[PDB]
Amino acid sequence: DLCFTNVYADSFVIRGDEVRQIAPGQTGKIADYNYKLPDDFTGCVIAWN
């Protein structure tokens, strides 16, 4: 039901236990050095084995 000006699909691969780090305000190897989400992130995170 929603429109948006732009959408960004950021794609990559990680291991299972690091999926939790792909979320706003997380810490760890991934969240710190690889891919950081902003605290005011507005979007969806999709992951599958």
Add this chain to the structure above:
Amino acid sequence: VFNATRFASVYAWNRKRISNCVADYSVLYNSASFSTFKCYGVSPTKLN
């Protein structure tokens, strides 16, 4: 504490007191040896 050869049972958990020293917490939070590093009422980076 961390490199102790044998650990105590949870019911008789050991307690070590730390005092009068410089604590370089980077040595801990920058290590990749820990699965859970969860800090309450403090942020790990700030510990230094």
